[PDB]
Every structure is written in structure tokens, then in C-alpha cells.
Amino acid sequence: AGTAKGHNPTEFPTIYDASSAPTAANTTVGIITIGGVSQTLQDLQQFTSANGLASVNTQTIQTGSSNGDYSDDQQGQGEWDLDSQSIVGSAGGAVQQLLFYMADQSASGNTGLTQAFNQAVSDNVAKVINVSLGWCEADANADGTLQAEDRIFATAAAQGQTFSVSSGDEGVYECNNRGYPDGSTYSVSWPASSPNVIAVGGTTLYTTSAGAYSNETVWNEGLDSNGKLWATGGGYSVYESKPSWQSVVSGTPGRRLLPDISFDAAQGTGALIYNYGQLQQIGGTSLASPIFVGLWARLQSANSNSLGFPAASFYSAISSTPSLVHDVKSGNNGYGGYGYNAGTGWDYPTGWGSLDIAKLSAYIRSNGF
């Protein structure tokens, strides 16, 4: 059913039923970056101007040493472009401010990135923060990055901030040189496996000829020319214990299950993004996470930025209220007959599926969150 095609980010409110909600004009949103965003800010101006939108108020924050390296990473600009344009589109064309928390590129190990997360939590000005990044959780564990960063996310959750993190682009093969098929050996991405963030997986998005939502399947576009798998990350952490709100997914291990929710991720149904002035059709869970961030920021604006970290409420509300989501039922996030399969209700490729924002907003008005 429906058609697979690229989409302007301004289409995401129509697709996920958010047009009747407020924009995110009253909510400040952050984006974690590696290095600078100078070209990204030019591409953002192109984005708002081409779409006839009011300009976005931005700030860039050097999160580490004042002598650090915050030069633009050229390939990185495409990520910060995807993130910023998808947030602003999904938000209905307005955010209060977009803050770019830039990691120092000349810091030791992963310490630049850790310090970027730290600054966003310390400052506590952004209500929702996008993280379209990740890597094998076992590698993060081995060198202590996991432990250091989980402390920061724990503080964020306690203070009511929502970090949104892409679940991964490697399907179940995150730890096998970042997505090479490995049979029955499955792994997950950090920081998505943290119980202190919302992990956002990936769908293949079909729309009707009139541009309305039609259906979603799992994101899995198979192998590229190098033999690497492109599919939604999903599974469970080998380290993190299950938070109690996930007990509603019976028959799963005592571990943090991910993702929590999912949005559009297939390149073939991806977003049209300005990158160094040129439009490109881009996917990944790097796309799905900023869609969530923009939509969630609308719900914050509708609720005076008073909604806390929403994981427990998503699990209780969605398990009891299937109308709040588009339940993905078809596809798998592996290769060669391996990987997890989607199915009725929560599944490992897609978690609960995508949010129907107007229905979720009505739920929140009635029940709180």
C-alpha cells in the first residue's frame, strides 16, 4: 500500500498527525554535534528561507576547552543538517531556540562527546536534546565511556530533560565492525541502550498519493556495496538492567530493551536535506530521532514544558492504548534469515512504532504524562 518516496521535513507533521498541535515555538531544543556547525547554519538558513518560514534562533556552544577544535567536520555537516532541518520541520516550522552543543574534536578518547552531553545537562536550558550518534555499547563499556555518560543522562532524566538517541543503522550487527552480517550474533548501540534516554528506531514510510500516512514497515535496506547492513538498531543491552516500566513487554530478558519508539528511517523514504547547498535524500535512525525530537517539542510547548522524562509514561500509555501508535508488524532487522522480526505490539526492530501525535496529545490532556 502507498508509495515509497522522499519527503520534505515540513511534511512530517502531516504524516505523524501533528498539524493540530502547537509548534515548538515555546520549547528550546538541543542538538549534540561533533565539531562545528558553520556550514550547517547556512544550510539551515536555506531550509527556512526556501520553505517560507520565520528564521530560527540558534546558538553554538563550545562544550570543552576554549582552545579545543570546533572546526567543521565536512561529513558531519550532513548529520547536523539532517538533525536541524528534520527537527524544525517536524516541530511545525518553529522552535524557541536551537542550541548546538559542540564536542571538542581534539579531546582525548570520547571525552569531547562526554563533555558535550555534560554541558547540555549542566546548563539545563534545552528541554529536548537530539543525539543522532552511536557505536557498539561493548566498546563504550570497555573504556569507561558508558559509565561516565550514563551518569550524565541519569541527571538529565531526573531534571526532566529528554535525550533522544538514534537506535543504530547496523540492524542487529552493531558490534561486528559496525554492521557486517554476523549470523545469530546480535548487539546494540550506545547511547541508545541507556535507560535514561529515549531510543528511536527506524521505519520504512509509505504515504498515499495525497501525502497522507499509509503504512510503516521495518527499516531494512540490506547490504551496501561494501557488504554492510543498513537497518534499524534494536535488541537489548547486555549491561543495562530493565527499567521497571518495560515489564509490560513480557517474555523479554532483564535488560534495557530498545528502541522505545520509531519513525521514518529508510533512505528510500527519507528526508530531502540541504547539505552544502545541495539537496540530498537522507535516512537512518539519524533521521528518526530528530523527527521524534521535533514532534515531542510540540507536545512540550502544548504543556508548558512541564512533561518529564517520558519513558515510563510511553510504556504504560501505549501498552494500554494501542491507538496512540502506528504498530509496525512487517520486516526484520537482520540479514540472511537472522535478526529480530516485527510483530504485534512492542518488538525489537521498532519498539512501539511511531506516535500519532494528536492522539497522544489528547491522551496527555486527559491523563497527564
- Provide the annotated active-site residues: 79, 83, 286
What nine digits make up the cell of 69?
577544535
Our CB check for Ca ion shows the closer of 274 and 346 to be 346
Helix (H, G, I), strand (E, B) or coil at 342: coil
Rounded to whole angstroms, the Cα distance separating 91 from 357 reads 11
Segment lying near Ca ion (by CB under 5 A), choices 94-102, 153-161, 271-279, 322-330:
322-330
Q: Which of 221, 327, 354, 355 binds Ca ion (CB under 5 A)?
A: 327
Residue 109's Cβ-count burial label (10 Å; 0-12, 13-18, 19+) is: exposed
The footprint of Ca ion on this chain (CB under 5 A) covers a number of residues equal to 3
The amino acid sitting at 253 is P
- H/E segment holding residue 90: helix 74-90
Residue 3 three-state SS = strand
Return the residues of window 258-287 that contact Ca ion according to CB under 5 A.
Answer: none
Q: How far is the CB of 294 from Ca ion (least distance, A)?
A: 23
72 binds Ca ion, rule: CB under 5 A: no
| Residue closest to Ca ion when measured from CB atoms | 347
Among residues 190 and 352, whose Cβ is nearest to Ca ion?
352
Q: Name the binding residues.
A: 327-328, 343, 345, 347
Task: List the chain gaps (C–N > 2.5 A) by preceding residue.
Answer: none
121, 161, 163 from 296: Cα distances, Å: 18, 11, 11
Whole-angstrom Cα distance, residue 28 to residue 127? 6
Least separation in angstroms between CB 317 and Ca ion: 16
Considering the complex, state which of residue 170 and residue 327 has its C-beta at the smaller distance from Ca ion: 327
347 binding Ca ion? (CB under 5 A) = yes
Q: Are the C-beta atoms of residues 170 and 298 closer than 8 Å to each other?
A: no
* CA angle (165, 232, 313) in 5-degree steps: 50
Q: What residues are designated binding site for Ca(2+)?
A: 327-328, 343, 345, 347
Return the number of the residue (266 or 328) whose C-beta is nearest Ca ion.
328
Among residues 147 and 323, whose Cβ is nearest to Ca ion? 323
Q: Does 240 bind Ca ion (CB under 5 A)?
A: no
Do 69 and 35 form a contact (C-beta atoms < 8 A)? yes
Please give the residue ranges that form the binding site for Ca ion (CB under 5 A). 327-328, 347
